[PDB]
Structures are given as structure tokens and as C-alpha cells.
Design a protein around this ligand. Structure first.
Ligand SMILES: OCC(CO)NC[C@@H](O)COc1cc2ccccc2c2ccccc12
Ligand SMILES: *[C@@H]1O[C@H](CO)[C@@H](O)[C@H](O)[C@H]1NC(C)=O
Ligand SMILES: [Co+2]
Ligand SMILES: [Co+2]
Length: 434
């Protein structure tokens, strides 16, 4: 796709701190950009829609290449259309925003300049942020995560993408998403199937795969930490059901691991650690700090701070594993006790280390789940299981929760606020901000 300018594009600025081992930190100035799927896609020379509702223009977009030549992405009104704002080091995302139309959620990337994404090398480093999840009920996911996207949004590889990172192109993740409207500088109209339960979305014949580090998938009820390896580390197109992932008939038949090696304290048995109010170790009515450390062995460590009190990730015992470090003994034990082979099939933490050794893009989002109602995060899943099935219970939400139309109707003013991002060598991010 190209870019059009009927609507100006001004990325909301966002600062973060880069910390050094010597004990100081220095402020960095970036900004956020909304993913291309949320934008208006129209003809390059008029206001005619290329995509409207959950269908494509059959005349502008008769095939993937012609559509990309004929169509452009336009600018975003971040606050009034998308419910997105920033202030200093803080980013807020509203759930339902009513303007001339209804918008649900957003997926945002941290930039380095107005035309390039910021890349982070996680290995050997730690990432800290503060979050307020108090306004996130069952069924919503305020996510902070990394993906192995290109810094230019794909422009150097895909000449027919001239919009780039400035317009939020180039997304990929471990679900090999097929809901993207543009992949590899071409549209995804070929094979498009409109969603029966979502007036705005569909599934195309291609998907976009890459490694994904889910630092934080959470609401006020549940939270999880999940690495997802892929056999190709960075962005790569996939073909139809060969994609696997959420958007294919076969979830487990692709190059990425769409389930991951999740660490969810509630799921592992500590049902008292995280939740609303003073009966939980971390009170999700109040802001909390989340620190995630990527040691060079490939294991992942985690601690939290709230009201100046520090808590390591709670200990868990699962099969022959015992501890609080997410390491390949944990992930192997999790497959043996809870089931699955996807994570190990795709190379486990060894393969995942290839992603964290390289650059990844920071993603912050708020979404509801039109495929599984977020039950995999915060409820019992699959819903016919009970607490007697190991790992089935992920959180205390009802198995009836999270129907998109219902939570959009009941909780439109839900929101997430991410703030005070700090990044640097392990042990450095708790030192004074510059
Ligand atoms: O929040 C960011 C997303 C980026 O797309 N992170 C991964 C998320 O897509 C994982 O979703 C799932 C993760 C998952 C893990 C184990 C079992 C089932 C599921 C599942 C089932 C249906 C729909 C989704 C899932
Ligand atoms: C849950 O984890 C917290 C933090 O490690 C710990 O203080 C608490 O005792 C744990 N509770 C249970 C029931 O495991
Ligand atoms: Co193809
Ligand atoms: Co270690």
C-alpha cells in the first residue's frame, strides 16, 4: 500500500529510559503509531473505500497486487477516533471509542523516528513498565509484547509498500495472523472470508508470521508471561491453512508456536497472587510495576513492585520442576503436565533466544477476542474441562465471559494505561530515572 494524506498523521510522542550498567539512565524520545489494519484504506486518487465493513472493493481490489497499487492507508485521529493518548512516559488506550463510527481497541508500535520502529535487543537486558489494569474486566487483554518486525515496516523488502512504519505496516506475530489487510506490500483480498461475528474483520489467504515475546497479557483478573518461538525468526508470509494459528482451521500446522510456554501464576496454583483488592498479593485496583529479565541462558526472570514492596514471580511446582524462573525445565514440565507439543516442536527457548538476540518491536494493545472470548487467559479452557483437568483453570472468570458484543456494550469505557518504560542491562532499571 501507499500512504495518503486526507487525514494528517501525527504520532503521539512517548518517552522511555535507556539504562546503563553504570547506574544512570537517560531519557529517549520516541512516539506511537497505530497498526495499518485500524486505518481507512481508500483509492489513491479519491475517497472511495478499498475496504469497507468486512469486504473489499471488487473493482479496486480484484487481486492482491492490483489492490496494493490502487489503494492507500490514511492518517489516524488518535484520540477522537481511536481513544489513544500519551503524556510524557505514559500511553493510554480506551476500549470503545464513538466518533462518526465505533472503534474497538488499538494495536500500537513504539517508533524511533516518524518513519521507523524502535528495535530492542532483549537478550541480556531487562524491560520494566508500570501498568494500571484496574479498568480491564474479564474478556479484555491489555497487552505489552515484542515481535520480530522489520524496522521499516517491510518497505525495503516489499517495494509496493511505500507507507511503511509511519503508517503501522509490517505486523507479524506467533498466530501468523491472516486478518491483516496488507502483507508483504500486497493486499490480502485473495481468499478473503468476512467474519460472521465481526462487521469489521475477516480472514485472507495469507498470514504474517514471526517470533513473539508476550511480556504482559492481562486484565484485572489474570496475567500471563509467554514466549512463542517460530522456525523462521522474523517476518515471513504464510499460505492459507499452512499458516496455523488462530485464523486457520488447523491451529498447530504452521511455522510458529501459537500457544507458547505460558507462565500464569493463577494457572500454576497461586490463586491469591494477583487480583482486585487487598485479598491479593498484587492489588489490581492500583498501579503496579512489572520487570522482566532475559538472562543469556535463554531463561526469563520476573519480579513485581507495588507500593515499594518487591515480589519475585511466585514459586510453582509442576511435575519435576520447582522454582520461579521460566526455563526449559519449566516449559518441558508444562507440556508434560498440561499437554501440548507446539513450544518444543518449534525449538523451545533455544529457538526463542534467536529472536531475543536480534531486534524486536514493542507493541502495546487493547483487544477483545472474537475467536475464544479471552477464556484461554482468564477462565477455564476448553470450557468443558474442570479444575480436575491439569492447567484447565487459568483464572476465575466465568466460561460465559468475554463475548465481544457484550463487553463492548457493558464496558465501553474500559481502558489500559502503560507508563514509565525503562530498558537496559539486567539489574539497571530500578536506578533513578534521568
Ligand atoms: O495479546 C497479543 C496476542 C498477539 O496476537 N498474543 C497471543 C495470543 O494471540 C494467544 O492467543 C491464544 C493462546 C492460546 C494458548 C493456548 C491455547 C489456546 C490459545 C488460544 C485459543 C484461541 C485464541 C487465541 C489463543
Ligand atoms: C502466592 O505468591 C506470593 C508471592 O510469592 C506468596 O507470598 C504467597 O504466599 C503465595 N500464596 C499461595 C497460596 O501460594
Ligand atoms: Co500465496
Ligand atoms: Co537463571
Amino acid at each position: 500500500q501507499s500512504a495518503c494524506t486526507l487525514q494528517s498523521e501525527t504520532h503521539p510522542p512517548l518517552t522511555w529510559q535507556k539504562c546503563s550498567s553504570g547506574g544512570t539512565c537517560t531519557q529517549q524520545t520516541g512516539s506511537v503509531v497505530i497498526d495499518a489494519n485500524w486505518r481507512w484504506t481508500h483509492a489513491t486518487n479519491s475517497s472511495t473505500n478499498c475496504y469497507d465493513g468486512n469486504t473489499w472493493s471488487s473493482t479496486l481490489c480484484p487481486d492482491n497486487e492490483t489492490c496494493a497499487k490502487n489503494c492507500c492507508l490514511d492518517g489516524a485521529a488518535y484520540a477522537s477516533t481511536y481513544g489513544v493518548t500519551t503524556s510524557g512516559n505514559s500511553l493510554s488506550i480506551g476500549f470503545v471509542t464513538q466518533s462518526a463510527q465505533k472503534n474497538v481497541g488499538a494495536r500500537l508500535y513504539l517508533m524511533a523516528s516518524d518513519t521507523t520502529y524502535q528495535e530492542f535487543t532483549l537478550l541480556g537486558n531487562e524491560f520494566s513498565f508500570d501498568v494500571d489494569v484496574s479498568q480491564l474486566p474479564c474478556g479484555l487483554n491489555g497487552a505489552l509484547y515484542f515481535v520480530s518486525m522489520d524496522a521499516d515496516g517491510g518497505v525495503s523488502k516489499y517495494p509496493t509498500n511505500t507507507a511503511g512504519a509511519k503508517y503501522g505496516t509490517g505486523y507479524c506475530d506467533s498466530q501468523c495472523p491472516r486478518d491483516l489487510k496488507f502483507i508483504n506490500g500486497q493486499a490480502n483480498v485473495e481468499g478473503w472470508e468476512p467474519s460472521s461475528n465481526n462487521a469489521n474483520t475477516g480472514i485472507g489467504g495469507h498470514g504474517s508470521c514471526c517470533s513473539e515475546m508476550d511480556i504482559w497479557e492481562a486484565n484485572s483478573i489474570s496475567e500471563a508471561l509467554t514466549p512463542h518461538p517460530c522456525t523462521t525468526v522474523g517476518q515471513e508470509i504464510c499460505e492459507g491453512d499452512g499458516c496455523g494459528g488462530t485464523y486457520s482451521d488447523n491451529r498447530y500446522g504452521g511455522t510458529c508456536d501459537p500457544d507458547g510456554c505460558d507462565w500464569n501464576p493463577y494457572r500454576l496454583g497461586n490463586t491469591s497472587f494477583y487480583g482486585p483488592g487487598s485479598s491479593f498479593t498484587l492489588d489490581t485496583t492500583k498501579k503496579l510495576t512489572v520487570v522482566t529479565q532475559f538472562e543469556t541462558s535463554g531463561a526469563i526472570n520476573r519480579y513485581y513492585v507495588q507500593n515499594g514492596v518487591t515480589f519475585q514471580q511466585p514459586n510453582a511446582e509442576l511435575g519435576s520442576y520447582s522454582g520461579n524462573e521460566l526455563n526449559d525445565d519449566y516449559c518441558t514440565a508444562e507440556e508434560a503436565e498440561f499437554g501440548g507439543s507446539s513450544f518444543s516442536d518449534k525449538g523451545g527457548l533455544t529457538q526463542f533466544k534467536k529472536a531475543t538476540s536480534g531486534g524486536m518491536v514493542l507493541v502495546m494493545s487493547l483487544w477483545d477476542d472474537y475467536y475464544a472470548n479471552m477464556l484461554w487467559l482468564d477462565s477455564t479452557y476448553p470450557t468443558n474441562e474442570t479444575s480436575s483437568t491439569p492447567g484447565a483453570v487459568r483464572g476465575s472468570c466465568s466460561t460465559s465471559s468475554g463475548v465481544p458484543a457484550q463487553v463492548e456494550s457493558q464496558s465501553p469505557n474500559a481502558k489500559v494505561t502503560f507508563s514509565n518504560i525503562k530498558f537496559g542491562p539486567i539489574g539497571s532499571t530500578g536506578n533513578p530515572s534521568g
